[PDB]
Design a protein around this ligand. Structure first.
Ligand SMILES: *C1(O)O[C@H](CS)[C@@H](CS)O1
Ligand SMILES: *C1(O)O[C@H](CS)[C@@H](CS)O1
Ligand SMILES: [Cl-]
Ligand SMILES: [Cl-]
Ligand SMILES: [Cl-]
Ligand SMILES: [Cl-]
Ligand SMILES: [Cl-]
Ligand SMILES: [Cl-]
Ligand SMILES: [Cl-]
Ligand SMILES: [Cl-]
Ligand SMILES: [Cl-]
Ligand SMILES: [Cl-]
Ligand SMILES: [Cl-]
Ligand SMILES: [Cl-]
Ligand SMILES: [Cl-]
Ligand SMILES: [Cl-]
Ligand SMILES: [Cl-]
Ligand SMILES: [Cl-]
Lengths: 573, 573
């Protein structure tokens, strides 16, 4: 009967190596075989409520005649084997898809959907070239694990993401244990302590010493902390280069304040020529999909629209798994929440056609240090060769406030920056108060002319919307670790005092700066614990003791000969 | 097969009057009949994700051999009939329970669970004396609709709760419509505008003029706004008096910052002698179960513990629906999140045995106006007859900040009160900085000696924990509308200038004020839009125009002859 279904729990699916993974089957009451959707989940297939509010009302898919299969990944919960992040997911997905294809109840069309880890696994599934896989819908995900979430395009470690997540997995490994252990109760409490104070846990040096996390999940050191370069151990699990080869439709969801935003958007750009790609980007962080934040509210329309997402996914799967060629009529290619005007808007492509990548140059009379310095931003090249200078001290890094934080205060993306404005290592450059709106929608980057007293250091840039009431709301940011200025693969040190021109990848945003506001840029050399602090030594940063580390006198050059600037994706419509 | 189940959608259940309600059946694969759990839902039975993250991982109940029945209430979604809040729920629940009892798959034991409206409906079900109903688990609910959520023990209208909720229902009535209408699109937008600015919507006078809400849901005026007294129209839907008659076990969940907290706790007290009652209270507001707020974090242990709640409910239903007499061994009678120490703690009863209801007297030299006035709190009666005076102007009420707000900024219960401290109509009284911890856990109230220049006015009291860093965190509060000082049923005006002794019911809290903190009380005459503003006229407040309203010179008397005080539930353990 249409609308009706049954659920089979713990159906055991064998992999090529003989290890069995557990799945639940949500199957519609139907005569024949049906199209099937797969979700690969490290957080207990039973616990459907934990992730689904970030995704879709997917029981609707089942009431509409799709089967849904939810799998425990290798070594977790009801599945056999050993858990190690990422490394088995390609082969386990491929084996799972073949098994589904072979079933009486599968009509030979298979899709996937899901958020975060349930999104990353979909790219891993898609690169196996299994013909029966017709569509994916990776939400808040990445096809390159180095670039998101563990490191980034700037070559700094996302220490808060790493510790927070590892603590979360650790806690799961315990609550679910095969045979319960004496140390469990106390370990559980310690992992909670990390989660209640991620910045504190990230502060312990050497970073590479993790007695609890390294024991519970060795991968934390063996893979992540020990591999600061984008080396073969990373490329081995990276899917990105293979994406151009694909012809798989993808429904891609991202958030402006989500740790994966940079990489989600890249996946859209990489697939859009070869197959039907769709993009949806709201003002969300990884753990906050409400549209409400401490000092910034986007309105109820900004709240993750779970029912509309469901309708959209259903239309998408109906088109690609059911051959219903008109299912996506009236559905835009790209849908974006444009902040400032705080409104959803349709677009024909991403990047937007007609994007004017516009330089805004750093200038001003006298020191730019602090928000009451004289730093300016202007579309005109600065008149005179100046330089702003500050001391960066690893023992006192600029604290992270909003942005794409994941676990450490990850529920306040559009954070007010006023608490860090009076600091001397935060350089501020702002436009005059605007009398006309300025839409900035696209990827964002900075070109800075810099020098350091040290042989390595970091530089950060943050785009800020300054409100008339005083609120200075974070929009997007990035970092470059100087050793990785040219390449993430073969780092080289720098000469003290030599001027370098560096690119800072600041991910992306969509904001209208309204009349009465200013456009601002904060420049510094740290953003902790979003990124781990550079030791300023040229050493292996994660193996260094705080006391071993150096301070750095860092300098930003600006003027006609050194035209440092942020490049803004200006839209005029 | 154990673990396995099927789901039947839109099974149509007839009521005594011939109208049919839609249910979904989640039934385990079983030989015989099973125990059954019922959930009565105004927010679409299909949409299980919207409420369930506030409740239980209830699919676990189905995998463990309970049937679960989810019903659309009368007139909503798949159900026939007309929707009017509350009035049909008793008879519709009773009819539904009989129908379940009559089914092949029901073993004659029925329970209920659910949050908010899904909690209120359970008390409505429980008063029908249906023998087969063996247990309920009303979460964040009330047995007296006047006292929560529409008015309160003080006799002021909860205007923000009323408008916010009505806008929410309005939006549902539209999205689900039988035959779609031309006005729908624009009405939808207007209801969003209310939800984005509840305080703004509450500001329009006369309150009783609601062209949009009154048209969409007439009940908003006909029942709620037109009945400011606790009259027979309220008692008609009140379950509270009948609760003493009952012998039904109840698993009761509440939040310290939840609009229903006062009434949830009362239901526990009313049933605990007659049947197995259980209580769980965390630091949550109605829409924020994270334990995280703008200026206050309770730690990850404070996060609504959905899996543990599931285990607890299962143990509870196993005991009362399955006759498993040892199922609740080791499970405490009462479980509370004690703020300050921020820890879960077991208790043997609520109110705690050994509660010392202790007077803290208002004192101080010179005016108590503002946080930098001289207002004090002390366990000793004040030496000298003083009085603090202020002007309350309805056109400028004290704004609501945290507390038990539902829709207007309802996600920040423990709000920092500093933004309203420099105001002249906020009187502040605080203790010296504490050198020993003081646990305040229980119901809280104030006795104030007051006078007014007007023939009616409000008085408010708010308990505040002042942190060493400056944060002044709201804990609990209340109001008395002076016409209702003696009774909620037969109001009488007051004589200008005459001194009255009034009680203010401040609901309940659990907090340890740690050494370094102070205990503080804010006294005023408004708290808007948590409560609607008193017009200071003696009129029908909701029918009055702002321009028609009066200001009031209000006065708090303190000293030996007028010993105004807050009564605090002191625990020493
Ligand atoms: C998702 O499930 O949350 C994590 C944030 S670091 C991420 C890890 S790949 O997946
Ligand atoms: C629950 O579902 O939310 C409402 C807050 S006013 C309440 C109405 S009885 O039930
Ligand atoms: Cl089968
Ligand atoms: Cl394995
Ligand atoms: Cl805002
Ligand atoms: Cl919009
Ligand atoms: Cl464009
Ligand atoms: Cl200026
Ligand atoms: Cl120099
Ligand atoms: Cl040069
Ligand atoms: Cl049947
Ligand atoms: Cl009806
Ligand atoms: Cl805190
Ligand atoms: Cl605890
Ligand atoms: Cl006690
Ligand atoms: Cl003092
Ligand atoms: Cl006088
Ligand atoms: Cl007197």
């Amino acid at each position: 009967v249409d609308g009706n279904y049954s659920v089979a729990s713990n159906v055991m699916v064998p992999m090529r190596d003989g290890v069995r993974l557990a799945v639940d089957l949500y199957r519609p009451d139907a005569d024949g075989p049906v199209p099937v959707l797969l979700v690969r989940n490290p957080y207990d297939k039973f616990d459907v409520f934990a992730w689904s509010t970030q995704s879709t009302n997917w029981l609707e898919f089942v009431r509409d005649g799709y089967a849904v299969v939810i799998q425990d990944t290798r070594g977790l919960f009801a599945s056999e084997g050993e858990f190690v992040p990422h490394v088995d997911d390609e082969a386990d997905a491929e084996d799972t898809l073949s098994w589904i294809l072979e079933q009486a109840w599968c009509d030979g069309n298979v899709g996937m959907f899901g958020v975060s880890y349930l999104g990353v696994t979909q790219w891993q599934a898609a690169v196996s070239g299994v013909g029966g896989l017709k569509a994916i819908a990776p939400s808040m995900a990445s096809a390159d694990l180095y670039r998101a979430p563990w490191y980034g395009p700037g070559g700094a470690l996302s220490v808060e993401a790493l510790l927070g997540w590892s603590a979360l997995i650790g806690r799961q490994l315990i609550t679910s244990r095969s045979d319960a252990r004496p140390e469990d109760a106390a370990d559980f409490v310690q992992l909670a302590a990390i989660l209640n104070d991620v910045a504190g846990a990230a502060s312990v040096t050497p970073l590479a010493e993790q007695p609890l996390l390294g024991r519970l999940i060795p991968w934390v050191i063996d893979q992540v902390v020990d591999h600061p370069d984008n080396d073969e151990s990373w490329q081995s699990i990276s899917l990105f280069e293979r994406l151009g080869g694909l012809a798989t439709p993808a429904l891609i969801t991202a958030g402006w304040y989500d740790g994966f935003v940079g990489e989600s958007l890249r996946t859209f750009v990489a697939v859009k020529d070869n197959a039907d790609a769709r993009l949806v980007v709201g003002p969300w962080s990884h753990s906050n999909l409400t549209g409400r934040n401490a000092d910034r509210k986007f309105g109820i329309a900004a709240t993750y629209p779970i029912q509309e997402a469901t309708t959209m996914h259903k239309a998408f799967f109906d088109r690609h798994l059911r051959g219903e060629t008109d299912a996506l009529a009236g559905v835009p290619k790209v849908r974006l929440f444009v902040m400032g005007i705080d409104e959803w808007r349709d677009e024909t492509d991403w990047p937007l056609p007609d994007t004017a990548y516009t330089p805004f140059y750093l200038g001003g009379s006298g020191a730019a240090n602090t928000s009451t310095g004289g730093g300016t931003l202007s579309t005109s090249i600065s008149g005179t060769e100046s330089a702003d200078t500050y001391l960066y001290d690893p023992a006192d890094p600029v604290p992270s406030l909003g942005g794409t934080l994941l676990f450490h205060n990850g529920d306040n993306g559009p954070a007010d920056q006023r608490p860090i404005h009076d600091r001397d290592d935060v350089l501020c450059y702002s436009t005059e108060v605007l009398t006309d709106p300025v839409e900035v929608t696209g990827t964002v980057s900075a070109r800075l002319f810099v020098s350091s007293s040290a042989v390595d250091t970091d530089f950060t840039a943050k785009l800020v919307d300054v409100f008339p009431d005083g609120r200075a709301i974070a929009l997007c940011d990035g970092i470059v670790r100087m050793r990785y200025r040219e390449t993430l693969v073969n780092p080289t040190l720098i000469e003290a005092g030599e001027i370098y021109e560096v690119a800072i990848d600041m991910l992306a945003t969509s904001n209208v700066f309204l009349p009465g506001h200013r456009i601002m840029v904060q420049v510094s050399s740290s953003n902790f614990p979003k990124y781990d602090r550079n030791s300023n030594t040229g050493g292996v940063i994660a193996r260094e003791q705080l006391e071993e580390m150096c301070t750095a006198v860092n300098r930003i050059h600006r003027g006609p000969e050194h035209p440092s600037h942020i490049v803004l994706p200006i839209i005029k419509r």
